[PDB]
Design a protein around this ligand. Structure first.
Ligand SMILES: COc1cc2ncnc(Nc3ccc(F)c(Cl)c3)c2cc1O
Ligand SMILES: COc1cc2ncnc(Nc3ccc(F)c(Cl)c3)c2cc1O
Lengths: 184, 184
């Protein structure tokens, strides 16, 4: 709860001012001393890693919940997941803002990254099925996510501004992202 | 010289804070009275449109000075422009951040979109031949540039973070942008 509050405050602080966000700020917003933040989190790096798992869990519950398992077609499954992630982001703007910054960032542990993929096994298989091999590689895995997230976050800004054409933005965003990242 | 000072200070504020950037902060960092900004630019929208054409004009000159007209394959020609844009963004981080927020904004006038299009008549004509028709359309043109600027800024962020792989990021980002935006 005091942990939960620090994770809420960390989502708000990071989305607004990115991962350079002050542990001191988070604590005051948390309604505690900085010393409490460090009791709960040994490092700012530990809190970033813990927060990313927190937000990715929150996002995958969304995605898991919406996944019609009758579907097998790779393109069809990914579109579904695209639609889940976008709608998750319209509904939680700060969560989307912090998670996109966290996902690309250098300070994620390998243990953090493994566990995230555990959270939705269906995506890891789909990416192994569909994505250009270069973006599955250790060297450019982060680059391909950063490209997915850029196109998703663009698709989101246009969607919010223009509820009227939101469906076209999502359709056009997804097909753009699919050509970008998958085998031709 | 008050105007050129302000244009530069508007660049730094809108890069940091998006178009939400306060005219109060712009004038102070510009070294002038907020009242004085308003004399040069009667409204915020006014400042936004002028700043946009200013950055667009600086970037297009760079792409024109660097363009090798001995390049005959339309794909290689665009890679060259992408290279110069990325090169420009890495040399000028605040200009690219700012030009992206401005380019994808409701606040730009049709007359601004006209003057901006004509800064490079042949880069314009190139897109007319090469880009997916939906992304040339009245409704979705802003979204196409939106998808392009997101792919380019992510490319610039990875090149800047990890200059060892700078070349492959640029190269990968171009091919992803190419499959994203263009006719097949
Ligand atoms: C087509 O390839 C991808 C599809 C994806 N779908 C959904 N999520 C992806 N990645 C992703 C990775 C990390 C994240 F935090 C978020 Cl919010 C999204 C995807 C990454 C891909 O490379
Ligand atoms: C092939 O598709 C495009 C290629 C582009 N190349 C270079 N520049 C484009 N637009 C652009 C590039 C830089 C900018 F700052 C702005 Cl505001 C717009 C392009 C837009 C496209 O849709």
């Amino acid at each position: 709860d005091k942990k939960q509050a620090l994770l809420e405050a960390a989502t708000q602080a990071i989305a607004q001012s990115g991962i350079a966000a002050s542990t001191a700020v988070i604590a005051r917003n948390a309604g505690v001393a900085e010393g409490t933040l460090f009791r709960y989190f040994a490092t700012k790096d530990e809190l970033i890693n813990t927060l990313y798992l927190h937000l990715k869990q929150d996002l995958c519950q969304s995605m898991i919940m919406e996944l019609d398992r009758s579907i097998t077609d790779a393109k069809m499954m990914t579109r579904f997941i695209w639609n889940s992630y976008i709608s998750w982001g319209l509904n939680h703007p700060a969560r989307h803002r912090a998670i996109r910054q966290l996902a690309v960032s250098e300070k994620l542990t390998k243990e953090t990254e493994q566990r995230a993929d555990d959270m939705f096994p269906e995506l890891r298989d789909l990416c192994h099925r569909s994505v250009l091999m270069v973006f599955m590689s250790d060297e450019y895995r982060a680059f391909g996510d950063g490209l997915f997230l850029a196109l998703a976050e663009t698709t989101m800004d246009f969607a919010a501004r223009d509820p009227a054409r939101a469906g076209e933005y999502i359709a056009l965003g997804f097909e753009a992202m699919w050509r970008a990242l998958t085998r031709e």
